Amino acid sequence: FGVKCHNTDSEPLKNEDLLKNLLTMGVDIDMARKRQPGVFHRMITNEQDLKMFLLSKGASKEVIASIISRYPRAITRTPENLSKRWDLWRKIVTSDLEIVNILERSPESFFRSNNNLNLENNIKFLYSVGLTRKCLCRLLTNAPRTFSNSLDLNKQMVEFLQAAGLSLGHNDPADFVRKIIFKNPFILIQSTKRVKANIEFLRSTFNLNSEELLVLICGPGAEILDLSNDYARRSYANIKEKLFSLGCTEEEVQKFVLSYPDVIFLAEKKFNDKIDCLMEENISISQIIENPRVLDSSISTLKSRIKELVNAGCNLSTLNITLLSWSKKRYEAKLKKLSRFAHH
DNA sequence: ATGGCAGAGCCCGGT
DNA sequence: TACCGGGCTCTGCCA
DNA sequence: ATGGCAGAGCCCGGT
DNA sequence: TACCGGGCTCTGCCA
């Protein structure tokens, strides 16, 4: 500055004209403005060029507008910047098409940042962690936000997971980490706060030794680290109480969960109802806890399966109820073999 | 999960 | 020259 | 015989 | 959440 002022007089509004039009010629303008209002109060939008870019990568005009719908801000970013970022993805992705499939799945990922520097940092950091192009690909598809993450953030998660494995005397923490990321691609987009808590859950809940704990966290209990605040704690408490209500043991319950931790992902009501319905048909509580995977089956199949079995002149306290959580093929297979067998 | 949300900072234009 | 602050953007957190 | 073989079930990972 | 099924394992049978 250094000269003078403005206008001071009732002035006509001046908006980005081409915007509204070009958009409607493809996109759901209503939804966008719901999500990213400020984009529309913006002038000089690079919407136009954007389209041609995506088009050059072989993207259906349909899906293109679908992307702007859920993430209006895509318009904001220049084609020259997008080109590099795209190429960075190419490292791990190998294919222009997969990137497309991932964008039409979660647009945020690619567009929530223009920082390609940091994006390069992230990629070369994740390789330095010992990851195969195959694995980073796994990450990129499932948890694309991971690379939109600040390098400091990603570095913090890793350092945390290392310190953790380390603190249990893991002879190779960076590898401990490697395993987790394989069993749980969405690990890098979770707060250390969350994970730390969820780990402390596993710790106190189960009474294992350092080694058993380590193996768990890598193995079956990896997914448990994504769980929401106090969800795991609640979900388990529910299980514990239901089983305890049936005369079980603190240690009986632990094995049951540890032998099949996916039970935590069941809705508290889904679980209770499944157990109750098995109980209804006089199926020993012990039969269940020693065949936890029978709780895979929807109560619907689980129920009919039973009735079918019973009617086929069978004895549910005698038989091997793994049958219930079997393929429609394999189940029907043993069923006839049985109805025929009990048919003598 | 991805979409919503909020705290912090930046762009930018106005005295 | 200095100083203000509106409003978008960015990053990370939640479920 | 013990090694080959087959029917049945389980581990486990992939949608 | 539900559901599938590939392929190893287990048990028992044969000569």
Curated annotation (Swiss-Prot):
Cellular location(s): Mitochondrion
Effect of R112A: Strongly reduces affinity for DNA. Strongly reduces transcription termination
GO biological process, one term: termination of mitochondrial transcription
Residues under site feature: Interaction with DNA: R105, R145, F186, Y231, R293
Pfam families to which the protein is assigned, alphabetical: mTERF
Post-translational modification: Phosphoprotein with mostly four phosphate groups. While the DNA-binding activity is unaffected by the phosphorylation state, only the phosphorylated form of the protein is active for termination activity. Functioning seems to be regulated by phosphorylation.
Sorted UniProt keywords: DNA-binding, Mitochondrion, Phosphoprotein, Repeat, Transcription, Transcription regulation, Transcription termination, Transit peptide
Outcome following mutation: R330A: Strongly reduces affinity for cognate DNA. Strongly reduces transcription termination
Cited InterPro entries: MTERF, MTERF_sf
Recorded GO CC terms: mitochondrial matrix; mitochondrial nucleoid; mitochondrion
MF GO annotations: double-stranded DNA binding; nucleic acid binding; RNA binding
Gene3D superfamilies assigned to the protein according to its UniProt record, in alphabetical order: Transcription termination factor 3, mitochondrial
Region (Interaction with DNA): 112-113, 190-194, 267-274, 298-301, 327-334
Record's function text: Transcription termination factor. Binds to a 28 bp region within the tRNA(Leu(uur)) gene at a position immediately adjacent to and downstream of the 16S rRNA gene; this region comprises a tridecamer sequence critical for directing accurate termination. Binds DNA along the major grove and promotes DNA bending and partial unwinding. Promotes base flipping. Transcription termination activity appears to be polarized with highest specificity for transcripts initiated on the light strand.
Comment text on domains: Contains nine structural repeats of about 35 residues, where each repeat contains three helices. The repeats form a left-handed superhelical assembly with a solenoid structure that wraps itself around DNA.
Assembly information from the UniProt record: Monomer.
Family designation: Belongs to the mTERF family.
Protein name: Transcription termination factor 1, mitochondrial
Lineage, broadest ranks: Eukaryota, Metazoa, Chordata, Craniata, Vertebrata
Gene, per the UniProt record: MTERF1
